[PDB]
Structure 1
């Protein structure tokens, strides 16, 4: 869940302005252009902040996006609407720079998406712009810039 469902017990202190963006609720990218192509797809599971792949059913229902990677990588999920079950996808043709889930890494390392849509060190897909940031016991994020697929 992008937004922590459990309510907080205390009001936050809005005095500092540093290191206030390394959160899982942060949706989108650090740098966003007005000419970016954005699509919306039915969500299979929770692909938020993970690479997505197109999955076709038996034909009765339309195609959807599921967390994955490898040669089946189609795009990167940057946002999700839970009420409508909709996943926001930036196509792999379009380049993306933002915080993505990392497999539980130093700047300059070449990262590729695994079968679960998690970035892992090495075809390369992105370059790590920072180090792993731990949000939960198994949840790690990393700032990466995706520039398509190149061997």
Structure 2
């Protein structure tokens, strides 16, 4: 879900400080500015670390995983109890680890959010640049460091 370390079978070792931050629980961004706009929205599904879109139906509009021409922002954190997602609007740039489609993503590759909110190699709709290679955490989970800086 969001924190897979609560079912750990053994205590971790904290002596090393290298290769210690590429994890699914690293919510937020690698570099964050105080003047970054954050919006909390109700969500349906699992939009964690994925591009999101607004869905309007009676209740207020909610967000869910999406991309393409319907992209609205990027979800960086979730409160599970309130079922709320923190979103950085597409008008605000971002740097951090995001979910990628497969492991074929390399450095300097231009990326696009797919219909599932995952980043895939490539016109385009937004400017997203991969900074590191795709890294596997789960059998179907790949994260990639990407700098998103607006639309094309």
Task: Work out whether the TM-score is over 0.5.
Answer: yes
1:18 and 1:145 map into 2 onto residues whose CA distance is 22
1:62 aligned to 2:64? no
Task: Report the count of equivalent residues.
Answer: 148
1:33 maps to what in 2? 33
Q: Matched residue of 2:4: which SS?
A: coil
- The whole-number CA distance in structure 1 between the counterparts of 2:5 and 2:25 is 11
Indicate the residue corresponding to 2:15 in structure 1: 15
CA RMSD of aligned residues (A): 1.0
Matched, 1:90 2:88: yes
For residues 1-151 of structure 1, the aligned pairs below 5 Å read: 1-4=1-4, 7-57=7-57, 60-104=58-102, 105-122=105-122, 123=124, 124-150=126-152
Gaps of 5+ in 1: none
Poorly superposed stretches of 4+, deviation over 6 Å = none
**In structure 2, what is the Cα distance between the partners aligned to 1:34 and 1:6?**
30
- Equivalent-residue separation in structure 2 for 1:66 and 1:83 (angstroms): 17
Quote the offset at 1:6 in angstroms.
Answer: 5.0
Normalization by structure 1: what TM-score? 0.95
Structure 2, unmatched stretches of 5+, are none
The CA distance in 2 between the partners of 1:9 and 1:134, in whole Å, is: 20
SS in 1 for 2:146: strand
